[PDB]
Write an enzyme that holds these catalytic residues in place. Structure first.
Site, short mmCIF file in Angstrom:
data_model
loop_
_atom_site.label_atom_id
_atom_site.label_comp_id
_atom_site.label_asym_id
_atom_site.label_seq_id
_atom_site.Cartn_x
_atom_site.Cartn_y
_atom_site.Cartn_z
N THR A 1 7.45 10.83 68.05
CA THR A 1 7.08 11.56 66.76
C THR A 1 6.85 11.03 65.54
O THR A 1 7.62 10.62 64.80
CB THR A 1 7.86 12.66 66.62
OG1 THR A 1 8.36 13.32 68.07
CG2 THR A 1 7.45 13.89 65.86
N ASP B 1 1.19 12.25 68.08
CA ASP B 1 1.41 12.05 69.56
C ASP B 1 2.16 13.25 70.16
O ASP B 1 2.65 14.11 69.63
CB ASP B 1 2.22 10.63 69.70
CG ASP B 1 3.52 10.84 69.37
OD1 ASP B 1 4.43 11.59 69.86
OD2 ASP B 1 3.91 10.26 68.20
N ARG C 1 4.27 13.50 72.74
CA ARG C 1 5.70 13.17 73.52
C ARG C 1 6.62 13.89 72.37
O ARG C 1 7.00 13.66 71.55
CB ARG C 1 6.43 11.88 73.59
CG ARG C 1 7.95 12.10 74.04
CD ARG C 1 8.61 10.72 74.33
NE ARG C 1 7.86 10.22 75.75
CZ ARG C 1 8.03 8.92 76.18
NH1 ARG C 1 8.42 7.91 75.45
NH2 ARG C 1 7.32 8.63 77.46
N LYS D 1 1.05 19.28 69.11
CA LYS D 1 1.94 19.24 67.78
C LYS D 1 0.69 19.61 66.49
O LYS D 1 1.25 19.70 65.42
CB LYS D 1 2.57 18.22 67.58
CG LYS D 1 3.65 17.97 68.47
CD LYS D 1 4.85 16.60 67.99
CE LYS D 1 6.08 16.81 68.63
NZ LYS D 1 7.02 17.80 68.28
N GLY E 1 9.70 16.62 63.53
CA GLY E 1 11.06 17.11 63.12
C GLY E 1 11.49 18.16 64.34
O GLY E 1 10.85 18.17 65.30
N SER F 1 9.51 10.53 62.50
CA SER F 1 10.50 9.60 62.81
C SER F 1 10.27 8.19 63.30
O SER F 1 10.81 7.41 62.83
CB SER F 1 11.39 10.32 64.07
OG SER F 1 10.42 10.60 65.37
N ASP G 1 8.84 2.54 68.97
CA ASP G 1 9.74 3.81 68.68
C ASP G 1 9.95 4.33 69.83
O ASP G 1 8.92 3.99 70.69
CB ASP G 1 9.01 5.08 67.70
CG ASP G 1 10.05 5.83 67.10
OD1 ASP G 1 10.01 6.81 66.80
OD2 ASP G 1 11.14 5.27 66.23
N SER H 1 8.26 8.30 70.24
CA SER H 1 6.64 8.22 70.48
C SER H 1 6.27 8.06 71.76
O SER H 1 7.22 7.08 73.02
CB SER H 1 5.97 7.01 69.42
OG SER H 1 6.38 7.46 68.26
#
Lengths: 249, 237, 244, 242, 242, 54, 226
Positions: G1, G17, G19, G33, G47, G129, G166, G169
């Site tokens: 994210t 992204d 995920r 998103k 978040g 994140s 990450d 992601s």
């Protein structure tokens, strides 16, 4: 204090409710508007009027947008129309775009606005809004639909109707002019021709306001790259498009 | 709204209590006569109209507890608001004080209910008069009360209210005795049928009779039953 | 000020009587007729529209007929605005009953609840009544088929045959002579049609001016099929009975 | 009932006489205004009259500053003028707070308009007997004049006047834009629009004016100012030397 | 009927109620406001009804804040409510903005309160005229407030029975002194025209109360003129009218 | 047949041509009759400027 | 994210992204998103999932009601403000991290709002994140005066490297490039990371393998006909 919570609408000794009898007369003291329902689309057309000729008319709207598929048009009072259009939109968002996260069907929107009229018939400190609305819109499951909501708070679906002062003559003209299949191209010529028998005024696109709930326009979408949704099925016709059709009557 | 629907009158009344009493006069007639060990409420039903479903429609005698019946005359529509209050109080008495209600306590409650809608603003009295009858629990004294839309309550030995009550009341001075009720349940029922046949008339199908015996037994006698009781009176007369 | 101009319409007359209730009853014989006829196998509800125009769309209209729940539908006669309100009050009440007991409402209970609502408006608050009359057709197991009329005062009585709206006296006389205790649904349909042919407030009586609906035991396994007919199924059963 | 126009209730004619009575009370100060759109400005001129020598002349005023962009010119009684000045101020604070830009004039026309409807829908509120002229210069709609009235009806304008003798002004403005054949004067500076405005007013009302009998308000781009009697004095000499 | 209340309207632009409130103020005693260079000077004619009274023990000039004099005529009890209300409103502003209220701000507030009492069925428009002023830091100002909620700036204002005598004499004072006069010199002027305003009121006897708010005498506070200064004013006027 | 379908101001012109026919048949008794009927169809205020000029 | 927004002086690109996670288990392999407050104002959310989606609904409604009464096109700043007040009265118990990107009659924009009521400006913002990893990439290859062709590479590669540095992601990179004077362009699946590796055995089973202890038929599709 205040103590206006007693009804100001009451039954009359002879029956019928006086205040709604008064309000309906008022609709025939107004401007003239009509709607024709076609197979593949819906048209509404009305006259734009102002106090003086030096007033604008592009800053005034008598065809107003509730949803991207549903427009309204009135005959009656200007002030009383303005407030109810806003309330129509407010209740369409709060009770159907929050709870189903989309726009309401035409029948469902009709009914909501009929409650608002209703509490203007019941209770103190209200007198009826003095308008008759047409609510033409399109939803997917019942297709094209045309309604009329009256001062009283009932609704009626129609196949073609008019409201305003030139109403009695106009529905007679449209009785012979209605056909079982009418195309939207053909209908546009019809509504203009009827409202030309009903309007003396200088006949341009700038005085006749035309709106169609025709078919979907992916260019008024405001975004691209989503093929899943499609654009507004409403499309307000500005002066230029009506000017070609003036010449084709 | 907090404006008055009760405007004091110079006469020493309130108009609306006098109007509410007329409304009671125009209502169907109820008789109450209590025996030594029963109560009997007879009531007229207009069954004169035909193709009436009578099975599904409530009698004009309503049980409000397992041993307290309420009958009524005046505005039929209005009555139902009183019957819903009174059923609610009956449970409340068990909840907080325990035991079933007494006929007196319930009658007083009704008295304060109809009273309220006189004295308050924003409301008009109820034009409904009740006959409240029944037993107290642990007891076997029939107690027969009448409440009236003035919000005045009364005990009575026998009473009648409704349309042309006066005609029945004069009969009841003369055929019921203050000193002695008729002692069999059956004779008490026939004394009340015999009374009903003054104004009601027109066959025995407009007569309905509810009989209550202590120990919580409310049963309502059907048409068939009445038919036999009426015919007896008919032959003997 | 305000008290000066106060109507005071919720006071008794010298007769003990409520002028606005009567005025409501006066105005419903200005709306169309709705009739209920109870057969032993089902209930026919037959309503004559109070509007008609060849430019009217009266085909998506269910402007007299409403489902309150899938077992109890109503016929409406009067001021439609006031009526619409009670119709969604009723739905809210049905679903409430269903939430708390997880069992469908009996016809006895829902008719008592609507009636108490009406009672409140004539009783106090200085309001005018809701001028509506409902013919409730419903099925429950406890007492079977039950037919009901309620009036703007808020009082109900059960009926084996009833008429509301326009020519109440007239329709009543007819019903009494051509009723029989037990009928088939068809014979009822016929009778429903026949009464409206002699009471129609225009000479002609047609399918597009009939809203017509039944509740039938032609659903197997002791269930009830609520059917609101399409106007093209009305057209055939009207040629069947030989009116048209 | 004999009550039928004490409250805002329709008549047998289907009309709100009560509301009409407001429009017969928009002409009690008997002041007149005219307001014209330049090309990159708006100009509004109104009469000033003092009935006595014993008032202070400055405070006597009819042109009320609402936003710093929206002027407001009032025809009709000054008690209801003020109540109208206040409500408007309230909405102007309110719009900036929640939407994070200054209030558009266009949006002030509909809010104050819808509020007017609410006063003729309660059966205990008496409508303001003030015709408001709202002058602005917007960037999104250009120079605009919106006229609301005691009913809550409104429309846009190319020019407009208000006042009891306002028929006369209508002749001047109609004749003027008939000759130009456009809705706005092609003039790139506010100075010469004050000069034009006063000229039609001298013709229409039939009386020439002085510094202490004028009141002028001017909307430019991004600020709203009122000119003092001294700046108005300069303007008057330059009509004579055209 | 349409001549009885405030929420009514009538097709003459009259709203008969409010006009009737001036008739209340017309039963009052003379009250003047002399606008001087340094401040404001009020005086009120106070009728001595009977020799049973305890003298100089009723104040018809009541202070609001510490710097805004307030003196009113019309219905005495009704006026006391209006002043209490403007002492609430002054106190709210003093807290919220931590300065003593301006006089154009005090004007807005009071103005609104009386205007309010013409828009509901259940209220009566107050029948008092106020005269209020003082010194704030934008200078001295003076306002007179009509029961109709009308007000203006004023170099001299009055109201009362003897508003007839008083007005003509205020013209005289701006033509005596058209460049203004001192707040000290104006004590003697308030005595002189209150005395002349008792020749429309000579069925009784009266007591003169004088108060001032001027920058240069009282340090911008609303104080009473008292002791020997007050009797010099009484003597001055007394000898002119004899 | 179009007089039951009387709603069109395009019947103004038909009466006007009938008037012209009797005009060159040189009787003005009947010319007037059809002229009256032309003014009756043109009493409708929704007629073009050109037909009224006619 | 992760969310990048890259303002340039021609338009704005905002990419994020697909995920979504619910802890170590991957909740959804594609979910959009990128929300449309308005047609001309798209935002993305990082978040808490249940709090981003629901509050784009609240303001989406409130901005359309608003625009209809104003009879002018939305401001971006209008979106930002509606959010700010709303978040703040719950005192940070709605954990919305939005990058509110939008064209309007004032030009191209990019704003941020954080989960407390804090709002920041910039021509490059990074949020969420996987922020840290996207941010690192940006500062090396950025400059002001990008085109839509420069910007779109830089943003999408910062999202691709965010996958690979990450764990929240992953999966497809969606990008939306909203130019001034045009309809917004949802170039979804601009970058595919990887195609899922071909498995070496079919796992579709014989029929009649499972047992049935009982069964019954109900058709809820109809209520019993005539």
């Amino acid at each position: 204090t205040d103590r206006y919570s007693f009804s100001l609408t009451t039954f009359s000794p002879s029956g019928k409710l006086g205040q709604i009898d008064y309000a309906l007369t008022a609709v025939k003291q107004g401007v003239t508007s009509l709607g024709i329902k076609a197979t593949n689309g819906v048209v509404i057309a009305t006259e734009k009027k102002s106090s003086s000729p030096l007033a604008m008319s592009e800053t005034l709207s008598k065809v107003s947008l509730l949803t991207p598929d549903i427009g309204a048009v009135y005959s009656g009072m200007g002030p009383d129309y303005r407030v109810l259009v806003d309330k129509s939109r407010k209740v369409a968002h709060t009770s159907y775009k929050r709870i189903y996260g989309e726009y309401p069907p035409t029948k469902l929107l009709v009914s909501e606005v009929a409650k608002i009229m209703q509490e203007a018939t019941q209770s103190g400190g209200v007198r009826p809004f003095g308008v008759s609305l047409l609510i033409a819109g399109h939803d997917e499951f019942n297709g094209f639909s045309l309604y009329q909501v009256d001062p009283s708070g009932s609704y009626f679906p129609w196949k073609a109707t008019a409201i305003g002062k030139g109403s009695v003559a106009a529905k007679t003209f449209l009785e012979k002019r209605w056909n079982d299949e009418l195309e939207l191209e053909d209908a546009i010529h019809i509504a203009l021709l009827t409202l030309k028998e009903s309007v003396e005024g200088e006949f341009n696109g700038d005085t006749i306001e035309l709106a169609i709930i025709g078919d979907e326009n992916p260019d008024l979408l405001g975004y691209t790259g989503i093929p899943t949704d499609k654009g507004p099925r409403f499309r307000k016709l500005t002066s230029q498009e009506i000017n070609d059709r003036l010449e084709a009557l | 709204y907090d404006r008055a629907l009760s405007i004091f009158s110079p006469d020493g009344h309130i108009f609306q209590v006098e109007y509410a009493l007329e409304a009671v006069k125009r209502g169907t007639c109820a008789v109450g006569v209590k025996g030594k060990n029963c109560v009997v409420l007879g009531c007229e039903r207009r069954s004169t109209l035909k193709l009436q479903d009578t099975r599904i429609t409530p009698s004009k005698v309503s049980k409000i507890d397992s041993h307290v019946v309420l009958s009524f005359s005046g505005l039929n529509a209005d009555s139902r608001i009183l019957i819903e209050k009174a059923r609610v109080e009956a449970q409340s008495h068990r909840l907080t004080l325990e035991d079933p209600v007494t006929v007196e306590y319930l009658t007083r409650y009704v008295a304060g209910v109809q009273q309220r809608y006189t004295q308050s603003g924003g409301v008009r009295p109820f034009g409904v008069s009740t006959l409240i009858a029944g037993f107290d629990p642990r007891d076997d004294e029939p107690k027969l009360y009448q409440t009236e839309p003035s919000g005045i309550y009364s005990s009575w030995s026998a009473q009648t209210i409704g349309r042309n009550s006066k005609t029945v009341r004069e009969f009841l001075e003369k055929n019921y005795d203050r000193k002695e009720p008729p002692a069999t349940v059956e004779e008490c029922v026939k004394l009340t049928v015999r009374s009903l046949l003054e104004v009601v008339q027109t066959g025995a199908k407009n007569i309905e009779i509810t009989v209550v015996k202590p120990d919580s037994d409310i049963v309502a006698l059907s048409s068939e039953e009445i038919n036999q009781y009426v015919t007896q009176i008919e032959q003997e007369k | 000020g305000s008290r000066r101009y106060d109507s005071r319409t919720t006071i008794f007359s010298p007769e003990g009587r409520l002028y606005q209730v009567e005025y409501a009853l006066e105005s419903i014989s200005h709306a169309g007729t709705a009739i209920g006829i109870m057969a032993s196998d089902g209930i026919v509800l037959a309503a004559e529209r109070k509007v008609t125009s060849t430019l009217l769309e009266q085909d998506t209209s269910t402007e007299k007929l409403y489902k309150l729940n899938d077992k109890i539908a109503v016929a409406v006669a009067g001021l439609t605005a006031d009526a619409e309100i009670l119709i969604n009050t009723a739905r809210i009440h049905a679903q409430n009953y269903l939430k708390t007991y997880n069992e469908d409402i009996p016809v006895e209970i829902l008719v008592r609840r609507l009636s108490d609502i009406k009672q409140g408006y004539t009783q106090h608050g200085g309001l005018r009544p809701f001028g509506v009359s409902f013919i409730y057709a419903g099925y429950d197991d406890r007492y079977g088929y039950q037919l009901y009329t309620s009036n703007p005062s808020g009082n109900y009585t059960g009926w084996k045959a009833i008429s509301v709206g326009a020519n109440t006296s007239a329709a009543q006389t007819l019903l009494q002579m051509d009723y029989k205790d037990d009928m088939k649904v068809d014979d009822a349909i016929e009778l429903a049609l026949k009464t409206l042919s002699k009471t129609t407030d225009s000479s002609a009586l047609t399918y597009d001016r009939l809203e017509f609906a039944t509740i039938r035991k032609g659903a197997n396994d002791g269930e009830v099929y609520q059917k609101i007919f399409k106007p093209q199924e009305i057209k055939d059963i009207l040629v069947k009975t030989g009116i048209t | 009932a004999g009550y039928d126009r004490h409250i805002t209730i329709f008549s047998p004619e289907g009309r709100l006489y009560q509301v009409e009575y407001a429009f017969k009370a928009t002409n009690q100060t008997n002041i007149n205004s005219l307001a014209v759109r330049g090309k990159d400005c708006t100009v509004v001129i109104s009469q000033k009259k003092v009935p006595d020598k014993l008032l202070d002349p400055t405070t006597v005023s009819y042109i009320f500053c609402i936003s710093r962009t929206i002027g407001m010119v009032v025809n009709g009684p000054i008690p209801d003028a003020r109540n109208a000045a206040l409500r408007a101020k309230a909405e102007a604070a309110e719009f900036r707070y929640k939407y994070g830009y200054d209030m558009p004039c266009d949006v002030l026309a509909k809010r104050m308009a819808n509020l007017s409807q609410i006063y003729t829908q309660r059966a205990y509120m008496r409508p303001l007997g003030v015709i408001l002229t709202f002058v602005s210069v917007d960037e999104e709609l250009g120079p605009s004049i919106y006229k609301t009235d005691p009913a809550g009806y409104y429309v846009g304008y190319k020019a407009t006047a208000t006042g009891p003798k306002q028929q006369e002004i209508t002749t001047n403005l109609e004749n003027h834009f008939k000759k130009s054949k456009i809705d706005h004067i092609n003039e790139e500076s506010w100075e010469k629009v004050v000069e034009f405005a006063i000229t039609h007013m001298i013709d229409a009302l039939g009386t020439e004016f002085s510094k202490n009998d004028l009141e002028v308000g001017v909307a430019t781009k991004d600020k709203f100012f009122t000119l003092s009697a001294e700046n108005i004095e300069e303007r008057l000499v330059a009509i004579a030397e055209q | 009927g349409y001549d009885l209340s405030n929420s009514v309207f009538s097709p003459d632009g009259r709203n008969f109620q409010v006009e009737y409130a001036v008739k209340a103020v017309e039963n009052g005693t003379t009250s003047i406001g002399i606008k001087c260079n340094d401040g404001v000077v009020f005086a009120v004619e106070k009728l001595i009804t009977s020799k049973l009274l305890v003298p100089q023990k009723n104040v018809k000039i009541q202070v609001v804040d510490r710097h805004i004099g307030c003196v009113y005529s019309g219905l005495i009890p009704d006026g006391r409510h209006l002043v209490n209300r403007g002492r609430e409103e002054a106190a709210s502003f003093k807290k919220l903005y931590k300065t003593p209220i301006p006089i154009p701000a005090f004007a807005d507030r009071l103005g609104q309160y009386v205007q309010a009492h013409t828009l509901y069925n259940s209220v009566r428009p107050f029948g008092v005229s106020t005269i209020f002023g003082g010194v704030d830091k934008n200078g001295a100002h003076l306002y007179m407030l009509e029961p109709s909620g009308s007000y203006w700036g004023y170099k001299g204002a009055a109201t009362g029975k003897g508003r007839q005598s008083a007005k003509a004499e205020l013209e005289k004072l701006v033509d005596h002194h058209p460049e203004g006069l001192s707040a000290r010199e104006a004590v003697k002027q308030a005595a002189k025209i209150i005395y002349l305003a008792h020749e429309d009121n000579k069925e009784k006897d009266f007591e003169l109360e004088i108060s001032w708010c001027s920058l240069s005498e009282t340090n911008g506070l609303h104080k009473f003129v008292k002791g020997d200064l007050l009797q010099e004013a009484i003597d001055f006027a007394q000898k002119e009218i004899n | 047949e179009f007089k039951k379908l009387d709603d069109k101001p395009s019947l103004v012109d038909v009466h006007l041509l009938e008037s012209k026919v009797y005009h060159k048949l040189r009787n003005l008794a009947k010319s007037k009759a059809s002229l009256t009927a032309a003014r009756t169809a043109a009493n409708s205020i929704y007629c073009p400027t050109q037909t009224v000029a006619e | 994210t992760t969310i990048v927004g890259v303002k340039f002086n021609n338009g704005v690109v905002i990419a994020a992204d697909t995920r979504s996670t619910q802890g170590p288990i991957v909740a959804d392999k594609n979910c959009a998103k990128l929300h449309r407050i308005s047609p001309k104002i798209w935002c993305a959310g990082a978040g808490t999932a249940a709090d981003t989606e629901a509050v784009t609904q609240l303001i989406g409604s409130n901005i359309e009601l608003h625009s209809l009464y104003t009879s002018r096109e939305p401001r971006v700043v209008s979106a930002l403000q509606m959010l700010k007040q709303h978040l703040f009265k719950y005192q940070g118990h709605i954990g919305a991290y939005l990058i509110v990107a939008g064209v309007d009659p004032t030009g191209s924009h990019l704003f941020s709002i954080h989960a407390h009521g804090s709002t920041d400006v910039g021509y490059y913002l990074s949020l969420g994140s996987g922020s840290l990893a996207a941010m690192a990439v940006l500062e090396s290859h950025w400059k002001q005066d990008l085109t839509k062709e420069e910007a779109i590479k830089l943003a999408s590669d910062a999202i691709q490297a965010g996958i690979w540095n990450d764990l929240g992601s992953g999966s497809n990179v969606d990008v939306c490039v909203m130019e001034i004077g045009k309809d917004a362009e949802y170039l979804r699946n601009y970058l595919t990371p990887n195609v899922r590796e071909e498995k070496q055995k079919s796992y579709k089973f014989p029929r009649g393998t499972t047992a049935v202890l009982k069964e019954s038929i109900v058709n809820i599709c109809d209520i019993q006909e005539e």
